[model samples]
Target: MVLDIQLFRDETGANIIRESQRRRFADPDIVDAIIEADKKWRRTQFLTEASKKLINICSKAVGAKKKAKEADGDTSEIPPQVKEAYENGTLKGEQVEQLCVLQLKQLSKDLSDQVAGLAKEAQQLEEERDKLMLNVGNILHESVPIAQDEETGNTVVRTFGNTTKRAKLNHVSIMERLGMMDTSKAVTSMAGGRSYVLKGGLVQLQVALVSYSLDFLVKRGYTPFYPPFFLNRDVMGEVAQLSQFDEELYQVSGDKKYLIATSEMPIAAYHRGRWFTELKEPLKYAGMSTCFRKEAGAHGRDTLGIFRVHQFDKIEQFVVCSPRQEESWRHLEDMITTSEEFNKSLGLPYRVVNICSGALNNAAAKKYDLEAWFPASGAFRELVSCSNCTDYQSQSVNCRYGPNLRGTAAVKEYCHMLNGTLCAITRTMCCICENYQTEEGVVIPDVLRPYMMGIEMIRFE
Candidate 1:
């Protein structure tokens, strides 16, 4: 939740953040607004501390006079000098001290009232500054292209295989004919739109795809985890800007919890508020879970197929490492390369794209998308999205690493976080069904055959 306030404190650092906002096509004025708010908040906080100091001085005087009076038991305390001092506000040394039991108490009450007023104002200003800071996007990396939107801004970084056209039938049409799915009943009979039930062979095919991808990651030293699907609001906020993603998420009725749109949400929260003694290497994780999204913003798009749907299974790749940009970028490449290799093994033609600044999400400092060639659509579609989120999420979740000891000698810094889609089961299934189709039926990817009980194809029985 901290926005590296130091960045906005100086002119040079503030300009860097402002430039990032401009690159994102967002309001640069927000940077200035937050700066002004922060300055005012800091000044008010100082004033509050000074006011408390004034109250403390008066409080000491009041306490000493009361204690002296109690010990002396002076019943005839209305002495001429005391009355004269109270009236004149001009008393000498210890005599003035004698009057403070009455005089200083009144002064302390007045100062306390002022302190409360200043404290309330400081609290309000702090909240205002924090609210603006929360919306500021992560600073962009230098390599990200400057453009307006996804279609115009993105650049193709590399290609894996040629765009060799194969099957003419779309996955939905062919799968229905093969008795592999029943989407209509899956929606109308019980669940609503964007729902599905893999009938027979397709369900097994999905299982094979998940197992193959999860194993691929595990072999490379990623620890496998099956995380919960539901996440609380605080966990979600740390990973995503709820202000922007709220409509895209499904909130459980009366629970205030949200169904996770990706396993990244829970996986990122796994080490929340934790500190590592030393991160010799990045922490790598392979998270498998069922993802749910409302698709509220994607209305009328990909409406005919399971390509865009309400729920699907996914294997996610997550990493937590030191806050060095060089190391994080290397991990970004490692994740994307891992995804590309898996797709290559599946024999799917795909291209790697560098997502432009304007299209990058709030958390990701930079992103790469792997788009697979779908024969039916005659165009490449997204199969994997790899991102280097830098320290954006770790700052919010309080995950850090540094020197560790039981003493106060340790200093910790936020860790960088990165996530990539290892495989989106239904979408990958869609790609395989189309790319590996035959006159007989869809051919299962050779790597997955062993996992699928030696099945060669989803034959049209």
Candidate 2:
């Protein structure tokens, strides 16, 4: 209710609906659908309220008639003359009106039936109203730019590191030569062609990447959490990405499980439908998870490597901050810088792009991506992404923070959710292998050597 329902009624200045022509919603008449349902709901309430008044009046009248009969003397106690008149059906006027019990019972049943019928009608109207509202999307931030498609490349904001002489082979070929990755067994053994095994030094490298990322975030005051790997359909739908990525998700064949698409799915949503006291500071989290995707939509694109694989480990930065009370831009900057620095430490050439309006996802009012230069593929691939959702996702999961309101005003507000990729294990491995590989062997960065048992290189076994 923070943003009024009336705002979506028209396409005027007050419409305030967060909309994307590039990524338009499936529903075309959604606004009119919601407005009409709301009107019907109010009408139902008015009709049912009137029915309640009539029910109350009928109930009281019935009670009074029953009380009068009880207080009157029994017919058996009447005098002989009076009793003969009552039995003969020639009773006086006062006697006839007071003893007519059947009429009162019939009137009560008629009134109760009216009330029950109207109550059911009101319930149905409310259900219709709720379904329409759920179909609506959040309002976009007022300052967002309008665009038609993804052709407008995002602005290159910054570049880090210097490109050295390129490698002859990409991460995939290098990993295969070093006995570190296998994907042939994946196609036939697992769900479609989406699974793989990270072997040899790559296994330890995956752990090291996640641990190192978490350690850096924890030092900066972000809490660490291992969230759920599976979310049911309803809960996952609330995250607002369920339908958006339906083609990308891997669902359990028999159960209700939608495998976690991102740790961000559970990290910011862990406190869904909760209230907090003294929420003076924004809460941040370093979330690590084994994420899954089906890649059901992408056919014959990057299918040979882990670059677009169905499963990988990742460390994500998630935040829940006060939108009305905090400097969310500062938090967004912090997230972007953290990702840039992490990539820079690997000594890989990269560029940061300010995601354009055409490329913004439903949740992103503004977004950024850190693209690592793959020396072997000769392409700049996105490795880390930062998005400022600006409370776009809070309601889907009922995530909220408190305000110290004194009296009549509503005291609760949705917390702004922002997410960034601190590290993606497979993608980072690509940057490292392509940037640091030698003709003799694949060299590990000095920083990672401590985690790799001091081994400087992964020579073939």
Candidate 3:
């Protein structure tokens, strides 16, 4: 279970004091009122316990009297004084037991009601704190050079190398012309929107992309893994926030499993509850997997090509590390560098942008998106996203470190987590198709020349 560290801290008077003050809950009067209510609740709980004990004793006494009556067949054998005492005691005990039971029920109800009220108050205080923090974030954002939207943001970053404009034929048109993307067959076999069968060179291209990225990551000391496409719903619920549970995720009915949107979900959960003594620092992974998303809300956008699809293959970089260090930002930078270097090798135009808060994931403190130039769209579209989840997923998954490794005997800390799309096969293929198109044919990048078996260009048959 994911424990609320803030709630514990609030009760213990640690960082919660400052947090409460920020939330406007630090007023002496309000604090005193909450404390007083808690104390009253505790006293009522004690009364309920006392009443329960009295009821139990009364029940036992009644049982004993019944047993004695059963043992003695005739009541005349008992003395009149004993009989009178038993009758009076039973009558008094029964009346008091009924009253105590009633009182206990009332007290229990009142305690529950009070606890619910206090919990709501605490929730409101935390919401107020988050709002204040968001305002601070907006102020910090305003200080930087801002991009109005995704399209304009790409133009502002200025990281695209040569090969900027679209050729005579963009990727979709070229694919259609080359008979590599069979839209008609795709529509007949699959559903209509955002579906295409990558035939011939395109199929080879997708495989090559995954192979290249995996090799690149392995060489960089990252562990390579191919995890399951489906995960238990309980696990998904534990890791995913409520806000992300809408139509974006695909869940299997009857079975408590959900199709993963990214490999990061499984990779993040791999080392859950495992402890490391030798590797105290961060662990990096490159996971290659097929991701599924509903795309329920994205109706009209990117419907022509495989840009936004139900299923796509991608190579994701996942990292887990101690929250004490500023590793998230560093990992983000590493992802960006890796992306830039990969694109440079392929001779594709791409740029990186510091994503606005509005575009970030629920758990991400910050995000950096790498947009590769898509000549067809005449815009740079997002191919990779690197996020710094500062103890968000770690806390959600109950991933923690021992005090000896953390350097504090009393403190058990959540680890920082990060993930990035190293190279998405479909999107990267789109970049290659659009930028490398020529009058004669589609010219292959010098780096991918060996993979293509020294084929310099591809021509329409």
Candidate 4:
């Protein structure tokens, strides 16, 4: 899940990875531990090879003696003491000359045993080193700000649209007033807490948002996908460390599968364990799916609406490309721009923030969050997250390039992965509901009107 072992061998590379760990407020000693463990495995591997070599030499020498005996040749090479002992009948022929080859066979057996013992230790050492390597975060991009927490260190990249005055009620209240949603019946008894039923126009609005976002991304050359909402443990581990995300991830009751938290999860899994021969440039995908989350940690926050619900629809943008830093950074900018444009089309005011180091997850070298203004709360809330993961996830899933190039001239490298949110339908709808509200009714954005059956507004029937 981290860089190749070669990175730990060189002093400069090891220090760089250690610095990345430090920036995340994580223990850097794990880097040294990994280096030491790898060295030990290599040493054991060398010894094992040496022992096997000695075994081969012993076997060949024993075979040579038998060949000479069969031909009645080189018997003169037998030692004088051994020859005398055999002639005097003081020692059996088998115990005198033949004992030399017997001892050689015994030595070979001992060497084989040594090799088997070292082989077991070598395997364990390698496994330990690999596990430790997974703990290290991807190296930070140069532009990422060094900060202690997500809240204090984020830098505002830009703002769009005009900020509006506070509304009397949030989206939940407006939806209830318009009779477009039924929160009371959509409680834990139906689909767990923080859930709501889109009773009327709300359902159409969700579809409109999802369809509009997918169309937007598709027009920009992103291949659209309706990804699987269920993923197995192996794919989940490649995208996220299970131990760290256990609180947020939802596991199936009787199967090894888990519910995906975003379309990004399954789209990221698409090219898992695949390697390309020649580069065809970056692969872009717009994934749409219904995502699930336990949200067990958010006990009492955003509990009134679909804002932090257990199930929601999302449109994700994902890319897989070469490991070159410049290429990946350019894609990262493209993702942020595309997401911002999507929001701007809806005419909602929002700001983009460069996520600080401490707030970054292990897989992301750098990240950006688009926090949209919520009139009811008089504050901005995160609606989109975009990240350039470098080779972290790709390393885990073994997606790479140059595996099938010509002969010794071929090069191999892990592919870089990047993902961003085009739309989280529930939250986006909430933002639209609050921002486009009027005394008469809730006004639908012009872009979404086409998808909402050309309805201009949502009012109580």
- CA error at residue 204 for candidate 2, angstroms: 1.2
How does model 2 fare in lDDT?
Answer: 0.70
Q: For residues 1-461, what per-residue lDDT tens digits would candidate 1 score against the true structure?
A: 55657778889978988999998998899999999998887776665665566557656766775666645333424456544543333433444345435555554565467667767888888778767877688999999999978898899999978786656898877777787777786564798877887877888899998899899999999999898777777777777675536567888866588888899999988878898766788899999999998887887788766788889999999998888547899999999999999999999999999999888888889999999999887889999999999988887788877765675651246889999999999999889888988878888889999989999998876
TM-score list, all predictions: 0.88, 0.80, 0.70, 0.86
Error of 4 at 232 (Å): 2.2
Error of 2 at 80 (Å): 45
lDDT of 2 by residue, 286-340 (tens): 9999888777677777887688887889999998887774467779889999888
Model 4, position 179: C-alpha lDDT score: 83
What lDDT score goes with residue 15 in model 2?
40
2 or 4, which is superior by lDDT? 4
Candidate scoring better on TM-score of 1 and 2? 1
Per-residue C-alpha lDDT of model 4 across residues 162-226, encoded as one tens digit per residue? 76678877887887888877668545577656777787788989988988999999999999988
User: What are the per-residue Cα lDDT tens digits for candidate 3 across 12-123?
Assistant: 6434433333332123333344444444544544444444444455455445556656342222232344235332332233443332333433433443454455456655
**lDDT at position 206, candidate 3:** 76
Please report, in order, the local distance difference test score of every candidate based on alpha carbons.
0.82, 0.70, 0.64, 0.81
Best by TM-score: 1
